[PDB]
């Protein structure tokens, strides 16, 4: 069950992998493999707190500017294996996965699809996601259906995602960069200085305490 005072839906922008790799002399894929381990840490800490909906923004559409993107997607899918094997999180993909290389995209899809019975948590993994594209998808979805604010929300590409209560962005960047513009409208915004591959339990506790203290 949920604890009152805790956020029902936490969204995390997994920022800082590129900077972390350059500072440590590693590849980008090694940073995303470590970033995937931090996602596993995150959902474990959320579980202990009874937080059942978690959305992580792993890859933006603008940052798709081929070979590295495939390695990134594969390192993420492998790093999510422990979450999948836990059976305690239903992993879903959001974003325009059709813009990703087909073979690594399929392997990421195959990891998520094996968690259809995961419960009670929901982990939404955003790849090739763009907030303005999310909103634009609502206007095309309405067109195909042949107008209230609830009607726009119903046809977002992320219509399956509810309101976000707490947004965490790492790497010290004080921006949302279009992360779920509809669902984060009234979200508490917390900015962590640490780069995502170094996201710690202290960072998590500080973020949650900032939410409860609002």
């Amino acid at each position: 069950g949920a604890h009152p005072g805790n956020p029902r839906h936490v969204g995390v922008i997994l920022d800082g992998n590129r900077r972390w790799a350059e500072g440590h002399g590693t590849t980008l894929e090694a940073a995303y493999a470590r970033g995937a381990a931090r996602v596993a840490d995150l959902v474990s800490w959320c579980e202990t707190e009874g937080i059942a909906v978690v959305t992580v923004w792993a890859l933006s559409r603008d940052n798709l500017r081929a070979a590295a993107v495939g390695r990134i997607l594969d390192a993420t899918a492998v790093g999510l294996a422990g979450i999948a094997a836990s059976g305690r999180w239903h992993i879903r993909l959001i974003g325009e996965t059709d813009l990703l290389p087909a073979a690594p995209a399929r392997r990421l899809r195959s990891v998520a699809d094996r968690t259809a019975t995961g419960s009670p948590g929901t982990l939404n993994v955003a790849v090739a996601y763009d907030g303005r594209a999310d909103i634009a998808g609502a206007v095309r979805g309405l067109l195909r259906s042949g107008v209230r604010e609830s009607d726009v929300e119903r046809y977002l590409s992320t219509a399956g995602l509810p309101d976000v209560d707490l947004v965490i962005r790492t790497s010290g960047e004080r921006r949302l960069s279009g992360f779920l513009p509809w669902q984060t409208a009234y979200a508490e915004l917390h900015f962590t200085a640490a780069l995502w591959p170094a996201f710690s339990f202290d960072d998590f506790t500080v973020a949650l305490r900032s939410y409860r203290a609002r």
Side-chain angles (χ1 to χ4, degrees):
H3 304 204
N6 271 358
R8 285 106 46 201
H9 185 183
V10 175
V12 191
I13 302 166
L14 318 184
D15 198 1
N17 285 14
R18 179 169 299 271
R19 289 177 54 200
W20 183 95
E22 204 176 1
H24 290 74
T26 81
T27 61
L28 201 48
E29 143 190 35
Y32 278 86
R34 195 173 278 251
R38 299 290 87 72
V39 170
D41 287 343
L42 168 73
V43 307
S44 168
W45 304 331
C46 286
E47 197 168 349
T48 303
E49 290 288 339
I51 296 152
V53 190
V54 175
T55 301
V56 295
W57 192 8
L59 249 201
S60 81
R61 204 183 47 173
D62 282 35
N63 279 327
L64 288 166
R65 47 189 177 184
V69 169
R71 269 114 64 181
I72 288 163
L73 288 173
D74 280 328
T76 297
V78 164
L80 289 171
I83 300 181
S86 86
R88 294 201 307 249
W89 289 88
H90 184 359
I91 302 174
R92 308 202 189 236
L93 306 185
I94 63 181
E96 317 289 86
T97 48
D98 230 315
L99 317 182
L100 302 173
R106 178 256 163 91
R107 294 194 273 280
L108 179 62
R109 184 67 73 179
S110 85
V111 170
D113 277 22
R114 89 216 289 299
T115 67
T117 71
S119 173
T122 300
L123 174 67
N124 305 302
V125 177
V127 288
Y129 174 85
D130 190 88
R132 285 174 178 185
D134 202 3
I135 295 168
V139 329
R140 309 182 272 252
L142 260 75
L143 185 52
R144 308 299 170 79
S145 91
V147 189
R148 297 278 214 279
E149 274 146 52
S150 54
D151 293 320
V152 172
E153 176 181 300
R154 257 193 317 121
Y155 281 95
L156 297 155
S157 326
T158 57
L161 273 75
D163 281 347
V164 171
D165 302 295
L166 168 65
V167 173
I168 300 167
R169 173 137 189 194
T170 45
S171 91
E173 171 89 304
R174 302 205 133 247
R175 310 169 19 201
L176 273 272
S177 300
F179 177 55
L180 300 173
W182 193 275
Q183 295 91 338
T184 61
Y186 294 95
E188 181 89 13
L189 310 176
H190 180 82
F191 301 119
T192 311
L195 316 169
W196 175 248
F199 193 74
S200 69
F201 185 70
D202 182 64
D203 294 328
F204 174 83
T205 300
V206 164
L208 248 67
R209 284 209 305 254
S210 84
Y211 181 86
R212 291 193 137 221
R214 92 219 191 257

